[PDB]
Amino acid sequence: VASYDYLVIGGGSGGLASARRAAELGARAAVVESHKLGGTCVNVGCVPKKVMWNTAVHSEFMHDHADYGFPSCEGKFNWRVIKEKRDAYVSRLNAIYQNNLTKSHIEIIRGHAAFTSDPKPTIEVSGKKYTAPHILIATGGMPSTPHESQIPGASLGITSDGFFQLEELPGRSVIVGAGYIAVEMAGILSALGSKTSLMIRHDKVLRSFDSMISTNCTEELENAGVEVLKFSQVKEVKKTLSGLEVSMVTAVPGRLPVMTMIPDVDCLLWAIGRVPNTKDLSLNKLGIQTDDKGHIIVDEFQNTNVKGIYAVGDVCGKALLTPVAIAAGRKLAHRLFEYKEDSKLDYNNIPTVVFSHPPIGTVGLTEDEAIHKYGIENVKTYSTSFTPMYHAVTKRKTKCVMKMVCANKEEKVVGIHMQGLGCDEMLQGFAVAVKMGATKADFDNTVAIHPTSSEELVTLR
Amino acid sequence: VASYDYLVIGGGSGGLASARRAAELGARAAVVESHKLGGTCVNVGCVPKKVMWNTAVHSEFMHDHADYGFPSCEGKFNWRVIKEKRDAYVSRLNAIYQNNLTKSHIEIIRGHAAFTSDPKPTIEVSGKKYTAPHILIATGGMPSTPHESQIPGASLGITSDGFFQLEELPGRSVIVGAGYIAVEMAGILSALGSKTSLMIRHDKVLRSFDSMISTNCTEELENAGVEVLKFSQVKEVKKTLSGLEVSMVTAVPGRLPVMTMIPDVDCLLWAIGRVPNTKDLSLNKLGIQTDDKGHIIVDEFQNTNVKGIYAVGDVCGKALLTPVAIAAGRKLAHRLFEYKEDSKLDYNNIPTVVFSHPPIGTVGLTEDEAIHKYGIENVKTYSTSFTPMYHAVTKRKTKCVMKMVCANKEEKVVGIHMQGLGCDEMLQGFAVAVKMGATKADFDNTVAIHPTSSEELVTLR
Numbered sequence A, B: 001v002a003s004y005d006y007l008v009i010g011g012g013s014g015g016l017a018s019a020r021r022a023a024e025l026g027a028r029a030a031v032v033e034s035h036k037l038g039g040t041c042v043n044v045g046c047v048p049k050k051v052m053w054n055t056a057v058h059s060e061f062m063h064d065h066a067d068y069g070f071p072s073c074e075g076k077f078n079w080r081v082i083k084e085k086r087d088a089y090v091s092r093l094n095a096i097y098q099n100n101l102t103k104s105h106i107e108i109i110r111g112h113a114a115f116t117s118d119p120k121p122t123i124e125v126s127g128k129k130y131t132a133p134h135i136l137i138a139t140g141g142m143p144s145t146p147h148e149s150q151i152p153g154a155s156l157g158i159t160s161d162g163f164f165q166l167e168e169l170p171g172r173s174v175i176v177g178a179g180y181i182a183v184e185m186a187g188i189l190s191a192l193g194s195k196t197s198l199m200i201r202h203d204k205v206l207r208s209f210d211s212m213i214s215t216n217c218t219e220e221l222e223n224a225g226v227e228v229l230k231f232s233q234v235k236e237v238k239k240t241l242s243g244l245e246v247s248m249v250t251a252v253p254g255r256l257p258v259m260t261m262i263p264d265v266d267c268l269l270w271a272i273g274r275v276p277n278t279k280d281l282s283l284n285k286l287g288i289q290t291d292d293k294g295h296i297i298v299d300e301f302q303n304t305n306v307k308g309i310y311a312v313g314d315v316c317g318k319a320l321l322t323p324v325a326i327a328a329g330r331k332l333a334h335r336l337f338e339y340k341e342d343s344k345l346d347y348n349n350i351p352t353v354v355f356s357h358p359p360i361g362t363v364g365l366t367e368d369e370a371i372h373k374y375g376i377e378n379v380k381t382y383s384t385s386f387t388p389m390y391h392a393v394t395k396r397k398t399k400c401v402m403k404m405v406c407a408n409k410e411e412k413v414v415g416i417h418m419q420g421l422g423c424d425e426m427l428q429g430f431a432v433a434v435k436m437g438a439t440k441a442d443f444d445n446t447v448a449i450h451p452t453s454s455e456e457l458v459t460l461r
């Protein structure tokens, strides 16, 4: 039984970040990883997604070429070219992460970890035992798929993982789900030329975002050529002579349900949720608490219910983002190895960018959330809607919408929501301002940068 | 003699902003404008410049098309197409500004104003007299050109004004100056296909910016195909059979001076400075103080040396930006018509974006300035340099450099300097944070947005 100061199960964002900081602090750490280092984020998430987004962004910009004084650009996007380049780049990152671990003197234990029956918390990987007084579970999650029992033929569809395996651009694609991943995938496939449908159970996407954003985002998708199938769900999927045939039920409220067949589908992409990876951990041997989806339950300090066992990142099921897993993993290392007992991540005011077209940036409370927290009488919002100057000379148009949610007399900024060209890079510093507790006067007292989109947020009235 | 509450001379950024706010406050105002409303900013500055920048940005992005999986885009940029569209857009803005004035009930007096000999400050426009207890001079500036006495043939060159009159893309262009305008023009002309040279008196451009920025900016220009002629200046210009011939002296220190002829020049663009527009105002009839360049001298509240006479914007020669003129003009209206005596613009921490390729964003003190303000022992900087993820798959490359200047033990953020893709939209919120007095912990405690360039500023170590 090899003993370490810190054993981290999972070599993705949270697990690596935590292991690296711990090692800086003098801890003797080891990371168990059964697949590729970098985990979701590098292999099938953040990185490959962004590359595909940059590609889709090229496609749109190329539509404006002639408007800008150039000759029309004519053609066909070649999926395999970019796919090969994207894979290579992921390969480069995996090699860097491995090197980062080595330079830090962190041991990499390759294989699938599981807890043992042993009294003092101990794991087994490939027959060998490993123990530490602090063990971090950072095993992440996976895409959720429907059971054949509920939706026959569901296994004919792919997930976001399968999306990163595709080698050709699917001619006809149907995406099921209304969350950010669904939105992102629909936007990429459509911009690159796939005849794309997005099938959502209600009338808008991103229903948990501020309502200005869910409305605007739904319209932008339609305007970009994505067919949004509202109040619809899949009833069955079948393999026809040439592709898939999707049977769906549309049930608009105030109307009779109607069943429709969608034929000749090349790609059926389930983007319905993520499930935690805890199933094969043998958690029950230690009696570690999970919720009914399999998420590990933790407190504000990432503690599980068992002493010396922690969990961070996707596996915990809250704020499923690369930077949160990292920040939580880091704060945890400072708490354990630097003896900073108050060291923990604040889960409020975490900013998010959704890589739609145009991108979305959000931080803090939606208007409804502020209304429930402070009361209608105490909430004031400011908003603007305009066409960015980039489109002054284009036939194709996109809008920029921004909304500021203020609370109390002081007009504290408690929420910022926007969608528009450049909003992906614009959000970070306002997130800093929001975290510091800025009020509207603080924004108003900052001299604008002209001509930009960003200047609209400091000149709202 | 028609009397008003407020008479504003100049209908550009500062003059309009001040007049509009004053009118909201109940003032009976009139704006004197001898040319087009919107002034520099709309007609020959900010707006038309940005449109030309967006165009140049299209040209660069089109170089990456094939790398992104598309077929090579082949050609020739058509200057007149975009020029016509740009003019139209400026026409649209002029009509809006005029309407804004009318809706506000502000009187527009068309013509050239000059002060009179009269005791109580009074102006004359087209034979008629006008007076007010508060008169704002906001007459802006103009491009500076060399005297034929010092540089013979200088009048064969054009200025940034003339740039906006061009109808064809000049084949060979030489830009003289090393400030932001020179840099911007060089970058646009070059990206659009002009064989461009930038002639600077020293070895770097933007010598007043933080030294990381002047160095990086000079390299980016060279990398983009702009020939930077260092330690050079124009000695004479002459009209040859086919274009202009520029005689220049290059005097590298530690070397003998060398004279060179630059032949076949289509466009010689002077971007050497701006001069205030005060010359024809008859300021001396009131004894209003100017410096030796013709700038009107004012105090912290925009007061001139004469009671009831103020000046804002370019004419004052400090912080020559559209938003500063606006903010100063607004604060002034609140002071005069809302009786807010402490109402004035803080000229510290004004953010600037330079529309180079990639763009530059700066706010606060350069490293040297912080060193002079706090002492070397009290200044700590953090910086990063990386290749944005956008170029992971391109043969063409650009860099992103960021620098954070902190002061004292607390590591107050006193300067942010960066150059890179997206830095034009990234700066605004960090400018808010800097204005609020953020420290490095405030940045560090803000969760990053992945994957973006902006996230680098919150993860500096």
Ligand SMILES: Cc1cc2nc3c(=O)[nH]c(=O)nc-3n(C[C@H](O)[C@H](O)[C@H](O)COP(=O)(O)OP(=O)(O)OC[C@H]3O[C@@H](n4cnc5c(N)ncnc54)[C@H](O)[C@@H]3O)c2cc1C
Binding pocket: A009, A010, A011, A012, A013, A014, A015, A032, A033, A034, A035, A036, A037, A038, A039, A040, A041, A044, A045, A046, A049, A111, A112, A113, A114, A138, A139, A140, A141, A160, A181, A277, A280, A281, A312, A313, A314, A315, A319, A320, A321, A322, A323, A325, B450, B451
């Ligand atoms: C398509 C997609 C796009 C996304 N886009 C973004 C985005 O743009 N921005 C953003 O912030 N977030 C994004 N996310 C979310 C972000 O990628 C995740 O929140 C983050 O990767 C979670 O990190 P983690 O450390 O919890 O787990 P992960 O990186 O999944 O790491 C878990 C690791 O544990 C390994 N493992 C699991 N069980 C075991 C075991 N028993 N033994 C050994 N090893 C094990 C797994 O192989 C894996 O390598 C995206 C996610 C997806 C799916």
Ligand SMILES: Cc1cc2nc3c(=O)[nH]c(=O)nc-3n(C[C@H](O)[C@H](O)[C@H](O)COP(=O)(O)OP(=O)(O)OC[C@H]3O[C@@H](n4cnc5c(N)ncnc54)[C@H](O)[C@@H]3O)c2cc1C
Binding pocket: A450, A451, B009, B010, B011, B012, B013, B014, B015, B032, B033, B034, B035, B036, B037, B038, B039, B040, B041, B044, B045, B046, B049, B111, B112, B113, B114, B138, B139, B140, B141, B160, B181, B277, B280, B281, B312, B313, B314, B315, B319, B320, B321, B322, B323, B325
């Ligand atoms: C090429 C270029 C690019 C620029 N790019 C940017 C940028 O991207 N961002 C930015 O922030 N700033 C930029 N600037 C600077 C910005 O445009 C100026 O700081 C701003 O326009 C100054 O406004 P102002 O109100 O002082 O004067 P102006 O807008 O020049 O207005 C002065 C007005 O007074 C009128 N006038 C003058 N004398 C008289 C008189 N006697 N009687 C009646 N009317 C009179 C003039 O016709 C004019 O309309 C740029 C400038 C230039 C030249």
